[PDB]
mmCIF file of N, CA and C in Angstrom:
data_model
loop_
_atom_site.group_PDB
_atom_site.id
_atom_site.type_symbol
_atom_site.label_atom_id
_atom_site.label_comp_id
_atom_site.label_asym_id
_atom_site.label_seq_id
_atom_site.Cartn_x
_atom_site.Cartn_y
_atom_site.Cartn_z
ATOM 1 N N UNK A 1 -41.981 -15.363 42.410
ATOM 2 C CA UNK A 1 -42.499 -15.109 41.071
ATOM 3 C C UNK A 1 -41.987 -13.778 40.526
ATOM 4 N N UNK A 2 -41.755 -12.724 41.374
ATOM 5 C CA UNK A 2 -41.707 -11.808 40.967
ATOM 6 C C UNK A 2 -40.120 -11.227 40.849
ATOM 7 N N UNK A 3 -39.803 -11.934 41.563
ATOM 8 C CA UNK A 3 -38.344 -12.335 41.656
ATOM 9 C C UNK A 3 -37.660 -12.515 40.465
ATOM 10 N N UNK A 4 -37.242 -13.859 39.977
ATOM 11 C CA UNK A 4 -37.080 -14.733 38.993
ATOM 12 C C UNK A 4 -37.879 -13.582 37.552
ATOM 13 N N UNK A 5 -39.015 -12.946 38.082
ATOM 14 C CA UNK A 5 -39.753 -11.783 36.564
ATOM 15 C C UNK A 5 -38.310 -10.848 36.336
ATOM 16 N N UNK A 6 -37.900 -10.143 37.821
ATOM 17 C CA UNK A 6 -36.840 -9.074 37.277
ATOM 18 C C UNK A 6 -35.759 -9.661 36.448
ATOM 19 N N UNK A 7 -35.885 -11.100 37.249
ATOM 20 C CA UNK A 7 -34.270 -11.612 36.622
ATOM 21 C C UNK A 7 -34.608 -12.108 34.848
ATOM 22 N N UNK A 8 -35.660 -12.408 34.094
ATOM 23 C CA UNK A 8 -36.097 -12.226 32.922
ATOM 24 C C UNK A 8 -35.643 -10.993 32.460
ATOM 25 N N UNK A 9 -36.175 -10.211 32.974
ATOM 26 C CA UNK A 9 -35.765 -8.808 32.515
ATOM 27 C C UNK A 9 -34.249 -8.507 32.237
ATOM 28 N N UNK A 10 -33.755 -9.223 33.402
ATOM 29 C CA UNK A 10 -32.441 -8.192 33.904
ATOM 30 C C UNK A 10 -31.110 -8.865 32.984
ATOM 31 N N UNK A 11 -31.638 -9.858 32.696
ATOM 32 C CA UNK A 11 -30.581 -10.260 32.006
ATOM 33 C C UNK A 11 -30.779 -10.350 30.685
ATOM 34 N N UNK A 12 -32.354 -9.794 30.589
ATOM 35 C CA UNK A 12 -32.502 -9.588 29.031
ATOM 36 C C UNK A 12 -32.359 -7.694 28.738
ATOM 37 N N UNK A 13 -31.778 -7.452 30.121
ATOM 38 C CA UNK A 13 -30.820 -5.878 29.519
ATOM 39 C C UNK A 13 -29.553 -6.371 29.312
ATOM 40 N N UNK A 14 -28.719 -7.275 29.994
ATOM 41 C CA UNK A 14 -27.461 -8.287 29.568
ATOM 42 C C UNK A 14 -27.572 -8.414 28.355
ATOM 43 N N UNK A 15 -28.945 -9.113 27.486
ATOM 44 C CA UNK A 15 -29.099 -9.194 26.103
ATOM 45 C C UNK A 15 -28.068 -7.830 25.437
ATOM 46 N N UNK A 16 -29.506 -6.856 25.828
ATOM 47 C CA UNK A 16 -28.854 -5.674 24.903
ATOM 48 C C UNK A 16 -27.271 -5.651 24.835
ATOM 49 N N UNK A 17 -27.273 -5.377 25.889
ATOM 50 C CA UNK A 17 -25.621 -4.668 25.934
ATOM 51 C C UNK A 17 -24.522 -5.505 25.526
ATOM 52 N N UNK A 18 -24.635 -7.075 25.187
ATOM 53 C CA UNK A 18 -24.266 -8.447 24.734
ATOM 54 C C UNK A 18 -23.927 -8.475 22.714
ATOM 55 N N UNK A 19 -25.330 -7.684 22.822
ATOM 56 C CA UNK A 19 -25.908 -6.886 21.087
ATOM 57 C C UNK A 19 -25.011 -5.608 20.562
ATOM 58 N N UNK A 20 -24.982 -5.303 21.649
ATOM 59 C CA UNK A 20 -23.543 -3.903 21.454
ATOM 60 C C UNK A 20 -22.120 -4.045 21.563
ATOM 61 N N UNK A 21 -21.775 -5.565 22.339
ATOM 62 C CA UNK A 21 -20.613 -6.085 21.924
ATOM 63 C C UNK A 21 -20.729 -6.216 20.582
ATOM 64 N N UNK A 22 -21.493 -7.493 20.110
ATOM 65 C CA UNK A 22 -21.273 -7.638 18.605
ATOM 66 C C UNK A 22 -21.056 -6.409 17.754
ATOM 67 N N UNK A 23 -21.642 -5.117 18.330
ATOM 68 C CA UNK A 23 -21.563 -4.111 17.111
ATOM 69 C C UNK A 23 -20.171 -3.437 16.881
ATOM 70 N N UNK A 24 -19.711 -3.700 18.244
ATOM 71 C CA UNK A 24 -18.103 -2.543 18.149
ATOM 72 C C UNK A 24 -17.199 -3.873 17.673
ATOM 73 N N UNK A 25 -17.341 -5.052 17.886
ATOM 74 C CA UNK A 25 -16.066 -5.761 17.634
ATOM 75 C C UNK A 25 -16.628 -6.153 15.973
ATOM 76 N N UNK A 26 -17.419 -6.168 15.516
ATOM 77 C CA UNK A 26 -17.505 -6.078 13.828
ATOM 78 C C UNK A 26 -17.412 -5.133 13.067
ATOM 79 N N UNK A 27 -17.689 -3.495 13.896
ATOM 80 C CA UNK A 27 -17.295 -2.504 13.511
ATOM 81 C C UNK A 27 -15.386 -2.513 13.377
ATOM 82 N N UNK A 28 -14.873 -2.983 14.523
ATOM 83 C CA UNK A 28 -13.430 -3.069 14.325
ATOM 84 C C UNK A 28 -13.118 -3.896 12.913
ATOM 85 N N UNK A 29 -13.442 -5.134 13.105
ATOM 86 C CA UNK A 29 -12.820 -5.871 11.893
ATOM 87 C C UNK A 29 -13.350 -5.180 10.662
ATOM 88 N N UNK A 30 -14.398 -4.690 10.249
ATOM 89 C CA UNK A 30 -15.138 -3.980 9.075
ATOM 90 C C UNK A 30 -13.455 -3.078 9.180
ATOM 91 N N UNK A 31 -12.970 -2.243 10.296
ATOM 92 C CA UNK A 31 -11.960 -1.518 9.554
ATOM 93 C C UNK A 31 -11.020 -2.150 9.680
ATOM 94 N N UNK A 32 -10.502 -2.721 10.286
ATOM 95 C CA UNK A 32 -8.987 -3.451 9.766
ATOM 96 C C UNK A 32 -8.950 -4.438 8.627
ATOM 97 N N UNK A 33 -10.121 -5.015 8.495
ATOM 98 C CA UNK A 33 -10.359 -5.617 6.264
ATOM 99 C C UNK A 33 -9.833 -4.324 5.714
ATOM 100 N N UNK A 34 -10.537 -2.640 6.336
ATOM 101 C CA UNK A 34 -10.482 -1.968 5.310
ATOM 102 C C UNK A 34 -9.003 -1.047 4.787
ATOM 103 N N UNK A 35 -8.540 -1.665 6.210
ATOM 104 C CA UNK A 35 -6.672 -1.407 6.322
ATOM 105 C C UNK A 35 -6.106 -2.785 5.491
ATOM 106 N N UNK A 36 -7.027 -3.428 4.911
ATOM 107 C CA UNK A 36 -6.292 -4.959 4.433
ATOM 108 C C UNK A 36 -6.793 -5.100 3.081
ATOM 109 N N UNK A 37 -7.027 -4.172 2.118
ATOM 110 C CA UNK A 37 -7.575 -4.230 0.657
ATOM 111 C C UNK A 37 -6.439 -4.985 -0.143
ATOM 112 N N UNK A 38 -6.995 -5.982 -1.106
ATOM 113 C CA UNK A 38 -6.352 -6.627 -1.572
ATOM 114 C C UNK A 38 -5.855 -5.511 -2.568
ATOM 115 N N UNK A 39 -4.376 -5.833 -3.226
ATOM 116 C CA UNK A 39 -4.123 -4.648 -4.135
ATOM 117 C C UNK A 39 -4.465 -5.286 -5.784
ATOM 118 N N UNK A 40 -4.396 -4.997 -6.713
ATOM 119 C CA UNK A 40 -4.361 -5.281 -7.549
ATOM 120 C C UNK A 40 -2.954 -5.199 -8.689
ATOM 121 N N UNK A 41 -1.549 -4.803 -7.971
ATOM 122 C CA UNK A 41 -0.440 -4.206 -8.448
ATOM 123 C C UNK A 41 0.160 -6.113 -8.652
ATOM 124 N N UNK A 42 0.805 -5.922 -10.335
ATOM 125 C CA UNK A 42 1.027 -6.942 -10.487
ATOM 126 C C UNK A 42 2.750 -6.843 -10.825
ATOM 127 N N UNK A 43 3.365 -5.934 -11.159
ATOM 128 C CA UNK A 43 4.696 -5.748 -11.168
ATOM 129 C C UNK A 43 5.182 -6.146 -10.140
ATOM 130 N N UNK B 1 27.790 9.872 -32.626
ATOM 131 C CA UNK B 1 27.856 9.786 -31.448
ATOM 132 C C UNK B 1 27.392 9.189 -30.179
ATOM 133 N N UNK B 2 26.938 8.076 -31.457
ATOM 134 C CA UNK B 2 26.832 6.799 -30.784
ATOM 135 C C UNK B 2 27.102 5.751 -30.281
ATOM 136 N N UNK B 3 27.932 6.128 -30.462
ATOM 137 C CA UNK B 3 29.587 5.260 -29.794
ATOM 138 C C UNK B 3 29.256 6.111 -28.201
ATOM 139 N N UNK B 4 28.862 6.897 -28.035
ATOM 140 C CA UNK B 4 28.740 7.465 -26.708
ATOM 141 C C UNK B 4 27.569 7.506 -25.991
ATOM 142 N N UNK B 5 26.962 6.403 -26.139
ATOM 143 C CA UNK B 5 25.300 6.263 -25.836
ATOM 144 C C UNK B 5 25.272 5.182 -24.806
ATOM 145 N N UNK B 6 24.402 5.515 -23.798
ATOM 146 C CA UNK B 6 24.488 4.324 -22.423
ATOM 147 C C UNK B 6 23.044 3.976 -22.555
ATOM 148 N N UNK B 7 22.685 2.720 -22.767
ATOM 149 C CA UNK B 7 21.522 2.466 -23.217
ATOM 150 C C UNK B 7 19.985 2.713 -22.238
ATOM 151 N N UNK B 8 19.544 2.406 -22.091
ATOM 152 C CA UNK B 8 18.373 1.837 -21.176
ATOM 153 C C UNK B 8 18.502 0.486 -20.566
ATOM 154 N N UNK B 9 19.171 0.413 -19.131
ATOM 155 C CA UNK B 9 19.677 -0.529 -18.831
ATOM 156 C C UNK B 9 18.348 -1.238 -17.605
ATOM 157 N N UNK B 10 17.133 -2.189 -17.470
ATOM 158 C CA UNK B 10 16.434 -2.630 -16.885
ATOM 159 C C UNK B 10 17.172 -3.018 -15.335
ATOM 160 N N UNK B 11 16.656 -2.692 -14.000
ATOM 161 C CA UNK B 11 17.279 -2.934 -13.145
ATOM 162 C C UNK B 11 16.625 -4.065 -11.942
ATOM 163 N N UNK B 12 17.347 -4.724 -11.086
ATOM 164 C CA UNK B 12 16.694 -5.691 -10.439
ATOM 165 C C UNK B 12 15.265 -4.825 -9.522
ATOM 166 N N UNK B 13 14.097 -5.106 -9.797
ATOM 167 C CA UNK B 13 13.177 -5.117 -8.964
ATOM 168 C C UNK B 13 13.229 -5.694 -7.248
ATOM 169 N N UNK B 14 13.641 -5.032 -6.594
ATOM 170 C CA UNK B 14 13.980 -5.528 -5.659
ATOM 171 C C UNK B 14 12.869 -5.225 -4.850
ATOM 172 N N UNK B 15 11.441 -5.855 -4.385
ATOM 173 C CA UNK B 15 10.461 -5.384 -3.674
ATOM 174 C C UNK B 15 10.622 -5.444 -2.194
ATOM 175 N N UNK B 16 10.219 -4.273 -1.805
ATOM 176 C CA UNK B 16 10.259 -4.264 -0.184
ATOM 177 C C UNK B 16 8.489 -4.260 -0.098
ATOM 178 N N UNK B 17 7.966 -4.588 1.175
ATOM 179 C CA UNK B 17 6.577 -4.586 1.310
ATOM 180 C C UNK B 17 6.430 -3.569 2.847
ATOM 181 N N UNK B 18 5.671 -2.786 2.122
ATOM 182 C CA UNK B 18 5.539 -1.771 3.461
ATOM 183 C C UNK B 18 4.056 -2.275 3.905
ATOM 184 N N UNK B 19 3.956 -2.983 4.883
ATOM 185 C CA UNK B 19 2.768 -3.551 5.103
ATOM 186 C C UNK B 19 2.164 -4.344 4.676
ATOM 187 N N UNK B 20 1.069 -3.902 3.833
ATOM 188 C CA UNK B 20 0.546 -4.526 2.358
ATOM 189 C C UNK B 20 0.832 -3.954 1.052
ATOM 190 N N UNK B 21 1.979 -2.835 0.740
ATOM 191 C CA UNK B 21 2.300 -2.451 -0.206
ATOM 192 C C UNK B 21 3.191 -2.604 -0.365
ATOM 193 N N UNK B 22 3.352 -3.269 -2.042
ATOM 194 C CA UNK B 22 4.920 -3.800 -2.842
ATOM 195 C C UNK B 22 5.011 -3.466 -3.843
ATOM 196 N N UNK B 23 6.730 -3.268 -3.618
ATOM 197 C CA UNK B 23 6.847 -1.946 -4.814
ATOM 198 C C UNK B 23 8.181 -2.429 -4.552
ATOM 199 N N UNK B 24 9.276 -1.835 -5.751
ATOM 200 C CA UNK B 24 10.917 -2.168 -5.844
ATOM 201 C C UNK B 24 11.028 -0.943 -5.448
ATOM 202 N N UNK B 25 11.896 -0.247 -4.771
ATOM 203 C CA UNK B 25 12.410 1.418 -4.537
ATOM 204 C C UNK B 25 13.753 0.885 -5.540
ATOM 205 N N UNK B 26 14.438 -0.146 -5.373
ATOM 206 C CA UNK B 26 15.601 0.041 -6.437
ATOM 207 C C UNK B 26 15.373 0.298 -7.544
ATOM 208 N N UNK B 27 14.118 -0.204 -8.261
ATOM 209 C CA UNK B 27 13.929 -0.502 -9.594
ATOM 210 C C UNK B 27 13.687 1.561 -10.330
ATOM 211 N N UNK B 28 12.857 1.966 -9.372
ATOM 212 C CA UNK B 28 12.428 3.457 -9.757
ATOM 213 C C UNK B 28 13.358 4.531 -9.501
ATOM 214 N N UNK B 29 14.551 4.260 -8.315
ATOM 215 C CA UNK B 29 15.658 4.436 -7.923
ATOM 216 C C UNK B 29 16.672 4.447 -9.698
ATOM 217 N N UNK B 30 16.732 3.683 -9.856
ATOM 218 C CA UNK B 30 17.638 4.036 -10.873
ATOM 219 C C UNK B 30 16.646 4.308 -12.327
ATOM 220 N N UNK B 31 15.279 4.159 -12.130
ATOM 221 C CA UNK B 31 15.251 4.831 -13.534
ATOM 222 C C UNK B 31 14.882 6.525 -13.688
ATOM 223 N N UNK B 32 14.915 6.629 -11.843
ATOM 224 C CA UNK B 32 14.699 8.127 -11.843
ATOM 225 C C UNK B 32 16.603 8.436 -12.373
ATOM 226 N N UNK B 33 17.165 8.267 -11.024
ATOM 227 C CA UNK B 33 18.261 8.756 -10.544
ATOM 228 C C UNK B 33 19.939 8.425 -12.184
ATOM 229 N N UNK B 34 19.318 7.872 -12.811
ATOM 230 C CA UNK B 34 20.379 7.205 -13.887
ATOM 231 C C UNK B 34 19.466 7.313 -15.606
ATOM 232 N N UNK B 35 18.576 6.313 -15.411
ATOM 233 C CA UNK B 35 18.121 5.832 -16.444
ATOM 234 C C UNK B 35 17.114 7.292 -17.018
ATOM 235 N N UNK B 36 17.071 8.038 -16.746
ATOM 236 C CA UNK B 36 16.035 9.174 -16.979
ATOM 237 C C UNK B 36 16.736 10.806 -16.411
ATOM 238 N N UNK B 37 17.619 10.544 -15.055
ATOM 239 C CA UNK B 37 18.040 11.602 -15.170
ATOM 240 C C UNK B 37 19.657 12.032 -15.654
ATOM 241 N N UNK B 38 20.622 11.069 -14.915
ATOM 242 C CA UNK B 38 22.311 10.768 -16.025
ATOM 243 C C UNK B 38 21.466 10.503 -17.639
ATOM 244 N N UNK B 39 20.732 9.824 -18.308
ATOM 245 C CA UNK B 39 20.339 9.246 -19.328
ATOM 246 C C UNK B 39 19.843 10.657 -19.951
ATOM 247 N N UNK B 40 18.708 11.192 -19.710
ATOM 248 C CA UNK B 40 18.727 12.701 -20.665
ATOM 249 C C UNK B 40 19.511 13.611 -20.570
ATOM 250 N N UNK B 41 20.318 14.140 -19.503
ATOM 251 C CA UNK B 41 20.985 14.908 -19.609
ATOM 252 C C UNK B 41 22.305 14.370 -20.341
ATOM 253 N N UNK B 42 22.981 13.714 -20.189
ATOM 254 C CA UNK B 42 23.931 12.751 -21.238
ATOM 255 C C UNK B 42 23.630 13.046 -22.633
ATOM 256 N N UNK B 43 22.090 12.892 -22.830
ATOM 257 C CA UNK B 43 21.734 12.854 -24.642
ATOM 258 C C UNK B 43 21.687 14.409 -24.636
ATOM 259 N N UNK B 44 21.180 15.087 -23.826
ATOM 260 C CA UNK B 44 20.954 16.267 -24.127
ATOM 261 C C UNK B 44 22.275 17.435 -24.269
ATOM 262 N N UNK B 45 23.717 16.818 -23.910
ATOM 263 C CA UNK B 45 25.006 17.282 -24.123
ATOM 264 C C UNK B 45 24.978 16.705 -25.505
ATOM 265 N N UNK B 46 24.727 15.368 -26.191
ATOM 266 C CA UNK B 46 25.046 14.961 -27.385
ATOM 267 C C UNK B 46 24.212 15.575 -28.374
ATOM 268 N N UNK B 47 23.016 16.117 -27.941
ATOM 269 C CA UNK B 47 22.122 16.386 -29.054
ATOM 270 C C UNK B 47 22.694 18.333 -29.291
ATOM 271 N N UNK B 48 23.164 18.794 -28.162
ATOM 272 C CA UNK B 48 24.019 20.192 -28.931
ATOM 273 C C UNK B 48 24.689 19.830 -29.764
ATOM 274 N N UNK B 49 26.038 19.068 -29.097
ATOM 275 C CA UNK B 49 27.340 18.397 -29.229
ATOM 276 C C UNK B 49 27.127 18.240 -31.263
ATOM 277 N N UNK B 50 25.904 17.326 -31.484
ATOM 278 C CA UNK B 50 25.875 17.443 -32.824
ATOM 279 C C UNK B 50 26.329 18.136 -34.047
#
């Protein structure tokens, strides 16, 4: 029981750190869109 | 002395793309280097010359 409790836990610290992937790899693309602005130059 | 006048001659836009930016270097290329700088100084011998 108590077993199987840590492993609830333990892989719901996996969660977190799973949550902090998502943040750096959308932080990346947020800047390479912002290296990718559409221009508005029509000549 | 107009018989001695080189007009404003439009030049091929030739765009290069540096990445995501496009632009002709020929086109500004000659309206610096000819069309604006041979081109006033040219008028500006004719306009003493007068």
């Amino acid at each position: 029981a108590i077993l199987l409790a840590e492993i609830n836990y333990q892989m719901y610290l996996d969660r977190q750190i799973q949550e902090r992937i998502l943040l750096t790899n959308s932080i990346m693309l947020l800047q390479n869109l912002k290296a990718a602005q559409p221009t508005a130059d029509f000549s | 002395t107009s018989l001695y006048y080189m007009k404003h001659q439009d030049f091929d836009c030739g765009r290069v793309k540096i990445l995501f930016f496009s632009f002709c270097l020929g086109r500004m290329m000659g309206d610096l280097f000819y069309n604006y700088v041979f081109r006033y100084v040219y008028n500006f011998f004719l306009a003493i010359f007068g």
